[PDB]
Design a protein that fits this description.
About 5% of the residues lie in helices and about 40% in strands. The protein has helices spanning about 105-115, 245, 255-260, 315-320; strands at about 5, 15, 20, 30-35, 50-55, 60-65, 70-75, 90-95, 100-105, 120-125, 130-140, 150, 150-160, 165, 175, 180-190, 210, 220-225, 250, 265-270, 275-285, 295-300, 305, 325-335, 335-345, 355, 360-365. Strand 14 and strand 15 (about 175) form a beta hairpin. It is classed as transferase.
C-alpha cells in the first residue's frame, strides 16, 4: 500500500524540485492533454504545473484506496495560457466521492486576488467505507465555453489526527471531528521559517509557512528559538501531528509585562463565510520550566477560547519542558475573517506576563458534505 502522486497530463514519470516522483494520471481515468505556453518565474518546478488534463464534459478519476482510513487529497492548479483555450472560460466543480470540494471555481480569478501563480487546494477526507475514491470534474453549465482542468492530484493515507474541538462561545460544548471532511486553509510555523513538504512529519509532505504576513497588531512580537541540541519529547503524541521544527520556535509578546498586558498579539485570516472552522494551536515550552511562569488568554473572533479561571499554561498542560501539545477550537462564522488574539492573564499572578504560540492550522469543515466557497 503506497501513496499516489499523479502529474496529470503527462505520459511518463517526472520529479519535482524536491525530486519527489510523480506519475501519469492515465491509469486512473475512468481526454485531452495540454502543455502551458508560459512558465511563470514563481513556479518552484515544472512538475506538475506545466502540464494539464482538459475536461470539456464531466470526467472521473478513480483511485484505489482503503476506505477504512482517512486520506489527504491535494489538487494542484496552474491557471496559465494554453493553446486554443481561454483560461478565463474555466468554471467547474470538483467532488471527492460524496463531498463537494469546489464549485463555480475560477482558478484564474482566485490567483489574481492572491497574487499567486498557482493554487494547491488540499483536503482531508473521512473514512468512506468505499473501496475507491472518485474525483469528478464537472465544467459549469452556466457559461457557454466552460471547461475544467487539473495539473496534479495527490492521495496520501493519513492517521486519525482529528478528534474533538472546543466551541469557543460556550462553557461545556465540544465538537466531534473524526468523521468530518476538512479543507486546510492556513498551515503556519509561528515564529519559524517555511518548512517544505519534504521536511514534514509522517510522510504527509505538508508545508508550514511563516506567520509574519498574518499579524494585524502593531507590534510583531518577539520570536523565540530553542538551541538545536534541544530535543522535543513527543511521548505518546503521534509524530504526524507536526514536525519538531514547529515546536522549536515560537512567537511571543515580549519581555515588558506592563506593556504586554495592555495589548493582544493578533493574527487574522481571510476565510469563507457560512462554515465552521477548527483552529489547531500548537505549543511547546522550551524556555520556562514550571507551572505559573507564563499564563495567558486566548480569544477567537472576539470570544473566549481560554480565559477567566482556566487560561492557557503550557507547562500547566504538559507538565515538563520540551513536551509538545495542541488544542483544537471550533467557531462558526456568519465577518469574512478569523481573528486569533493573545494577552497575558493575571489569574494566579504568574511569574511573567507573556503569551506564546508555536504553530497554527485552520481547517474548514463541511456543512452537509460541501466545502465549497466563492471566488475572491
Amino acid at each position: 500500500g503506497q501513496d499516489l502522486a499523479l502529474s496529470c497530463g503527462t505520459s511518463e514519470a517526472s520529479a519535482d524540485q524536491d525530486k519527489k516522483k510523480w506519475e501519469p494520471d492515465t491509469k486512473f481515468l475512468k481526454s485531452i492533454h495540454a502543455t502551458a505556453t508560459y512558465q511563470d518565474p514563481s513556479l518552484l518546478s515544472t512538475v506538475p504545473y506545466m502540464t494539464a488534463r482538459i475536461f470539456t464534459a464531466p470526467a472521473t478519476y478513480e483511485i484505489p484506496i482503503k476506505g477504512d482510513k482517512r486520506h489527504l487529497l491535494r489538487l494542484y492548479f496552474y491557471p496559465s495560457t494554453y493553446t486554443g483555450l481561454n483560461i478565463s472560460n474555466s468554471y467547474f466543480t470538483v467532488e471527492a466521492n460524496d463531498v463537494t470540494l469546489l464549485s463555480n471555481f475560477s482558478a484564474a480569478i482566485t490567483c489574481q486576488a492572491l497574487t499567486q501563480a498557482y493554487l494547491v487546494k488540499e483536503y482531508s477526507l473521512a473514512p468512506t467505507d468505499k473501496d475507491v475514491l472518485s474525483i469528478k470534474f464537472t465544467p459549469s453549465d452556466k457559461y457557454r465555453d466552460a471547461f475544467a482542468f487539473i495539473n496534479g492530484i495527490e492521495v496520501i493515507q493519513m492517521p486519525e489526527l482529528f478528534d474533538t474541538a472546543a466551541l469557543v462561545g460556550f462553557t461545556d460544548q465540544t465538537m466531534d471531528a473524526k468523521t468530518a471532511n476538512l479543507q486546510s486553509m492556513f498551515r503556519l510555523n509561528v515564529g519559524g521559517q517555511d518548512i517544505p513538504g519534504s521536511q514534514d512529519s509522517g510522510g504527509l509532505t505538508r508545508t508550514w509557512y511563516n506567520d509574519a504576513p498574518y499579524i494585524f497588531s502593531a507590534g510583531l512580537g518577539v520570536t523565540l528559538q530553542a538551541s538545536n541540541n534541544f530535543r522535543i519529547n513527543y511521548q505518546n503524541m503521534p509524530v504526524s501531528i507536526a514536525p519538531a521544527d514547529i515546536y522549536k520556535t515560537a512567537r511571543s509578546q515580549g519581555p515588558n509585562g506592563d506593556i504586554n498586558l495592555k495589548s493582544n498579539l493578533t493574527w487574522m485570516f481571510q476565510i469563507d463565510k457560512n462554515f465552521t472552522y477548527i483552529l489547531r494551536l500548537h505549543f511547546c515550552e522550551f524556555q520556562l520550566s514550571k507551572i505559573n511562569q507564563k499564563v495567558f488568554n486566548i480569544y477567537i473572533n472576539n470570544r473566549t477560547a481560554q480565559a477567566d479561571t482556566t487560561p492557557a499554561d503550557i507547562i500547566g498542560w504538559t507538565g515538563e519542558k520540551g513536551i509538545p501539545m495542541y488544542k483544537d477550537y471550533a467557531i462558526y462564522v456568519d465577518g469574512e475573517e478569523i481573528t486569533l488574539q493573545m494577552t497575558p492573564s493575571t489569574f494566579g499572578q504568574p511569574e511573567y506576563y507573556d503569551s506564546s504560540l508555536n504553530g497554527l492550522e485552520i481547517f474548514k469543515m463541511d456543512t452537509m458534505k460541501n466545502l465549497a466557497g466563492p471566488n475572491p
